[PDB]
Amino acid sequence: EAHKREWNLFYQKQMQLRKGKDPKIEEFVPPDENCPLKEASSRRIPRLTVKAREHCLRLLEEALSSNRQSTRTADEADLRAKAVELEHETFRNAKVANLYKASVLKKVADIHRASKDGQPYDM
Amino acid sequence: EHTTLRKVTANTAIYYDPNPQSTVVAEDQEWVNVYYEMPDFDVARISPWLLRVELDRKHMTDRKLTMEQIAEKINAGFGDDLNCIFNDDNAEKLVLRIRIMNSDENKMQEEEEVVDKMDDDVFLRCIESNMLTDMTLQGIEQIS
């Protein structure tokens, strides 16, 4: 109990020395003109820039395209909407940036596994 | 039943990794690149020293623990200023790479700040000891 509090204060003071002077740099960037991301302008996930969210959506898009060429469904028009839906589901289910990214790559890996097995990625 | 990180850790090492795209450990280079290519992630402030934790799969599965849960507990206990990255659950081994995210951006000749800074090697060792002893991944303390 006392050791836990001592460690907490000690760790906070140690990691404050690595912040030091000018601890401002927030500079949140609002989304660009044509961000294809549901709930683009949000701050639910700290330290998650909009560009990283777009990057994760883009990775989901390549995963969906690979699944398409490995399944041969109707067309790729719905791929973009499906990728946005999956990205929004990942964003909702995640709370911080790194675990959100990990969930994104887990979804990509699941899509790749479905493509290897030959089955389309269901909702 | 109390379960700290030690009960689910196969091993733990501290490396000097100045360049995450270099990744002196060869096995992780496949899945570390997909983490440092994100626009929000920059190698400018990542700290060179890296704490690599290899998790025992049998002990992890006996408790139905996921690397997602371990990372969530790390974020809760140590804040969002300690970078944590982990592999895929289907990989051959469970790897957890942790770095001390130094939020300073200037770093211009410092300000003679070497008084109690504790260069990240020994600080990472202390963080590792705290993570292995007082992390409470699962269960209630005083129950074994």
Both structure tokens of A98: 């790194």
The resolution, in angstroms to one decimal, equals 2.8
Asked whether the beta carbons of B137 and B131 are under 8 A apart, the reply is no
Phi, psi values for residue A121, rounded to 5°: -80, 110
Rounded distance between C-alpha atoms, residue B83 and residue A109, angstroms: 22
Both structure tokens of B71: 């990372």
Tally: H helices and E strands in chain B: 4, 4
Task: Give the chain A residue whose CA is nearest to the CA of B98.
Answer: A98
State which amino acid sits at residue B22.
Answer: S
- Between positions 45 and 104 of B, the ones with CB within 8 A of A are 67-68, 71-72, 75, 78-86, 88-90, 100, 102-104
- Please state the domain extents for chain B: 1-134
| Angle at the Cα of B17 from the Cα atoms of B22 and B120, rounded to 5 degrees | 160
**Does B35 lie at the interface with A, CB-CB under 8 angstroms?**
yes
Q: CB under 8 Å to A109, separation ≥6 — which residues?
A: B88, B90
Three-state SS string over B106-135 comes to CCCCCCCCCCCCCCHHHHHHHHHHHHHHCC
Q: For B109, left (φ over 0), alpha (ψ -120 to 50), or beta?
A: left
Fold of the CATH domain B1-134: Gyrase A; domain 2 (3.30.1360)
| Angle at the Cα of A59 from the Cα atoms of A122 and B29, rounded to 5 degrees | 115
Both structure tokens of B112: 């003679």
| Angle at the Cα of A27 from the Cα atoms of B127 and A48, rounded to 5 degrees | 55
Pairing of strands B94-100, B49-55: antiparallel
Task: Give the chain B residue whose CA is nearest to the CA of A103.
Answer: B68
H-run or E-run covering B53 = strand B49-55
Give every strand in the sheet of B82-86, ordered side by side. Answer: B9-16, B49-55, B94-100, B82-86
